[PDB]
Design a protein around this nucleic acid. Structure first.
Ligand code: K
Ligand code: K
Ligand code: K
Ligand code: MG
Ligand code: MG
Ligand code: MG
Ligand code: MG
Ligand code: MG
Ligand code: MG
Ligand code: MG
Ligand code: MG
Ligand code: MG
Ligand code: MG
Ligand code: MG
Ligand code: MG
Ligand code: MG
Ligand code: MG
Ligand code: MG
Ligand code: MG
Ligand code: MG
Ligand code: MG
Ligand code: MG
Ligand code: MG
Ligand code: MG
Ligand code: MG
Ligand code: MG
Ligand code: MG
Lengths: 208, 328, 96, 58
RNA sequence: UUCGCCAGAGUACUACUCGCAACUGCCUAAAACUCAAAGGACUUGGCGGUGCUUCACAUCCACCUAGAGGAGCCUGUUCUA
RNA sequence: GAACAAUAGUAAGCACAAUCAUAGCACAUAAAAACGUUAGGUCAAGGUGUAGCUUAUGGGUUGGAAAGAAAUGGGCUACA
């Protein structure tokens, strides 16, 4: 790490600076940020103040990347959002009056909602006691649950897809499947709940 | 070693006269800085250690401070605390404690007389006052100290400084005061330059990951950037790279109010894109008010990126990765 | 203490009372002995490891012109004098 | 059938308990050292005892 | 003041002998032979599947990414020659 | 052989530290890392103790050191 302990993470949100007069405690926070003369790290290349970005997209885009092809990973994430948009637009056209104002045509809304349904609620961690390993359920933290949902999405669409079907279209199908709570990822989430509920009497082993 | 110092003093003055004689200058004003530049010329030592170069200075500054003789011919110690081992430190402690009692006695008398003419002068924040460092204190008492002894002495001064302050005590205390240099993170705003009927154009310099960017921004044109004689869209096909150039302008809501031409060399597509981003941030400080310049720093625009590629160690596959380690 | 029994006049309700008649006899010789070693140009050191009269004893020695040591006593001070103080050091001729 | 379509009330409390247990676990260690429950920490008692040591000998 | 016991270690709470409601028993108790030591207490170090407290930022667990062991080829050992 | 509201330790040498290099500082990385441990590796870099050879364990010329049943380590290219 070329940054010393004094350097801190920069603040990028423009709206945080343009309307500071409506609050007092937050004003004391950033006025002392430079009054303490604390050094600020350089702005990361990925994050930007553009209003069209989203933090959950960047993390998902990074995991899709293999090697160092950020261009290819960004290209795949662009097509997948387009592919989802095309399918929802077509379904909207062929619908009745009541069905028309039900379909969502916002890929970002679909993407955010899809991952919030693939996150497990309670995980498992092996614990060694008496020379044997017992799968003990634990209340997984929010960051772990969010990361675990993304990994399951990538793992499924990389392994059990056909060789002919492209990556952007295969991932688009699973997002719609997870949006309706019927995708194989949702099945895997329930399977982890099945094992956690089966070993509900082993929760006493953990010591935290 | 009093005489040895005296011999060094007289010959250094004689030696300085010879140096001025051969240098052909005025010996009456052969200052130490002139001596250093003369020595560095006559004896051109190429060495990286700054302390290993030839030197000829005042022997008082060169030789370390020496303890004086502590006893007379009959053996009687001159000071009354010589048998405590550390006479200088404890005498300072004895005097410091005595001042506190005198202040307490003086304050007690003032309370009896119902007068409070003293004020707390401990607060020297605008001057930037800090207490003596242990190393500096050891060079003032000419005696070695310890961490426990130093902490006790400083805390005693705080008790002395927290009481009502007299004129004599403040002179005593201020000998232990040190002033920090000026601390500030404000940047120097480059004044606008006008050239050949050209109005409001500023220049910036940026560098990131083996890529230097030269950006000059005109405040009288429309929104366009000309990098290396070609349009920026053609030069930066990647959407992310063109997002980097947007980041400074979009933060100030001046996307279309400036005409720029750039010249960046070296590095890849992202290195140049980051370099041009840095150069615009520094070059745009002239057109922007001072308050938003601080906002620019808090967002990380104005700080150079120190992350550079590391070397490859001899005996490893890469910068950190080592070969496979077969245990058996 | 067991060795202070002869010097005790008695005990008053569990509180020992020191016989001042023996104190006066001892103090008379102590002051007489102290002056004579000072008359002959002798070094006198005041030693007292008590954190209530350290300043008073330190100031007392300054007025008399003699030396005092009411601080922490180093291990090799009086025995290994040449290393602690200096090459040639005159040891004190009396300690109080 | 292992679906949280009707278990929202229970799921949130489980998250709330996890956060509540997390908060108490990650703050007990620091404050308990100097809280002292009215009795001085072991470091202070050691210094106090050294000033008035016990005398087995003499 | 008085009684009992002790004369290197192993052989040995053993062999033989006297007494015993004991009969695979108890008490009494050697030698041949072997060794130049056996033994009591202590000091430092190492170690402990001993306890208490604290800690592993490539790290032991929990946990992240990319690989080796599977195939061809290149090269280096062992064995075969 | 230590107790800082200090109870026998003291000042120097080597090492750590600081400094230097990577052309600003900082951070990071290099570089450094004593006394010892493993009779660790190297008589085949070279030198050399001791032991051995001296028309031979020395010197030169010509030709030739093949081959992989099989096992394994570290790698490159892949299994899209
Ligand atoms: K030990
Ligand atoms: K291999
Ligand atoms: K040899
Ligand atoms: Mg690599
Ligand atoms: Mg005997
Ligand atoms: Mg025997
Ligand atoms: Mg028996
Ligand atoms: Mg028997
Ligand atoms: Mg590892
Ligand atoms: Mg590979
Ligand atoms: Mg293989
Ligand atoms: Mg092989
Ligand atoms: Mg040191
Ligand atoms: Mg440097
Ligand atoms: Mg460093
Ligand atoms: Mg190294
Ligand atoms: Mg170093
Ligand atoms: Mg060997
Ligand atoms: Mg080995
Ligand atoms: Mg060998
Ligand atoms: Mg040889
Ligand atoms: Mg050989
Ligand atoms: Mg030889
Ligand atoms: Mg031959
Ligand atoms: Mg194999
Ligand atoms: Mg290797
Ligand atoms: Mg290829």
């Amino acid at each position: 790490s070329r940054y010393g302990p004094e350097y801190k993470d920069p603040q990028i949100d423009k709206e945080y600076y343009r309307k500071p007069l409506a609050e007092q405690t937050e004003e004391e926070k950033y006025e002392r940020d430079f009054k303490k003369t604390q050094l600020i790290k350089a702005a990361p290349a990925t994050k930007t103040s553009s209003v069209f970005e989203d933090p959950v997209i960047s993390k998902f885009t990074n995991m899709m990347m293999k090697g160092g092809n950020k261009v290819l990973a960004r290209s795949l994430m662009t097509q997948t959002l387009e592919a989802v948009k095309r399918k929802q637009f077509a379904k909207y056209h062929a619908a009745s009056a009541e069905e028309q104002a039900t379909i969502e045509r916002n890929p970002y809304t679909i993407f955010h909602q899809a991952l919030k349904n693939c996150e497990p609620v309670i995980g498992l961690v092996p614990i060694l006691k008496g020379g044997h390993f017992y799968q003990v359920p634990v209340p997984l933290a929010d960051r772990r649950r969010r990361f675990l949902a993304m990994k399951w999405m990538i793992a499924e669409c990389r392994e059990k897809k056909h060789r002919r079907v492209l990556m952007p279209e295969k991932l688009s199908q699973e997002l719609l499947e997870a949006f309706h709570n019927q995708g194989p990822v949702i099945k895997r989430k329930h399977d982890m709940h099945k094992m956690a509920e089966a070993n509900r009497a082993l929760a006493h082993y953990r010591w935290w | 070693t009093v005489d040895f110092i005296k011999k060094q003093i007289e010959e250094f003055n004689i030696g300085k006269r010879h140096l001025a004689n051969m240098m052909g200058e005025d010996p009456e004003t052969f200052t130490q800085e002139d001596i250093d530049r003369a020595i560095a010329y006559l004896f051109p030592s190429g060495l990286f250690e700054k302390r290993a170069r030839p030197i000829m200075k005042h022997p008082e500054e060169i030789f370390p401070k020496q303890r004086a003789i502590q006893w007379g011919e009959d053996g009687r110690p001159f000071h009354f605390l010589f048998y405590t081992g550390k006479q200088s430190y404890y005498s300072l402690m004895h005097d410091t404690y005595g001042k506190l009692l005198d202040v307490e006695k003086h304050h007690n008398q003032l309370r009896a007389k119902d007068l409070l003419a003293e004020k707390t002068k401990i607060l020297k924040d605008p001057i930037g006052s800090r207490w003596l460092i242990k190393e500096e204190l050891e060079e003032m008492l000419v005696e070695k100290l310890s961490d426990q002894d130093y902490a006790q002495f400083i805390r005693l001064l705080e008790r002395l400084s927290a009481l009502p302050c007299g004129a004599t005590e403040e002179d005593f205390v201020n000998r232990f005061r040190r002033s920090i240099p000026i601390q500030s993170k404000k940047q120097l705003i480059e004044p606008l330059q006008y050239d050949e009927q050209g109005m409001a154009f500023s220049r910036g310099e940026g560098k990131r990951k083996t890529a230097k960017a030269e950006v000059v921004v005109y405040g009288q044109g429309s929104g366009r950037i000309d990098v290396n004689g070609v349009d920026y869209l053609l030069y930066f096909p990647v959407t992310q790279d063109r997002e980097q150039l947007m980041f400074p302008l979009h933060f100030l809501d001046r996307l279309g109010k400036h005409d720029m031409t750039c010249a960046v060399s070296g590095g890849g597509r992202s290195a140049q894109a980051g370099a041009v981003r840095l150069a615009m941030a520094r070059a745009l400080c002239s057109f922007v008010t001072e308050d938003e310049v601080e906002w620019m720093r808090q967002a990380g625009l104005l700080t150079a990126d120190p992350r550079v590629r590391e070397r490859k160690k001899p005996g490893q596959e890469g910068a950190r990765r080592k070969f496979t380690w077969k245990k058996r | 203490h067991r060795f202070m029994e002869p010097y005790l006049f008695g005990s008053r309700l569990g509180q020992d009372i020191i016989d001042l008649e023996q104190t006066a006899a001892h103090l008379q010789l102590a002051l007489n002995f102290t002056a004579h070693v000072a008359y002959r140009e002798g070094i006198i050191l005041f030693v007292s490891r008590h954190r209530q009269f350290a300043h008073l004893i330190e100031t007392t020695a300054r007025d008399c012109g003699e030396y005092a040591h009411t601080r922490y006593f180093k291990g090799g001070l009086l025995t290994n004098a040449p290393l602690l103080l200096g090459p040639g050091v005159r040891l004190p001729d009396l300690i109080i | 059938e292992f679906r949280d379509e009707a278990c929202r009330k229970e799921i949130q409390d489980f998250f709330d308990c996890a956060s509540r247990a997390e908060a108490a676990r990650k703050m007990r260690s620091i404050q308990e050292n100097l809280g002292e429950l009215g009795s001085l920490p072991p470091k202070k008692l050691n210094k106090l005892l050294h000033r008035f040591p016990n005398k087995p000998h003499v």
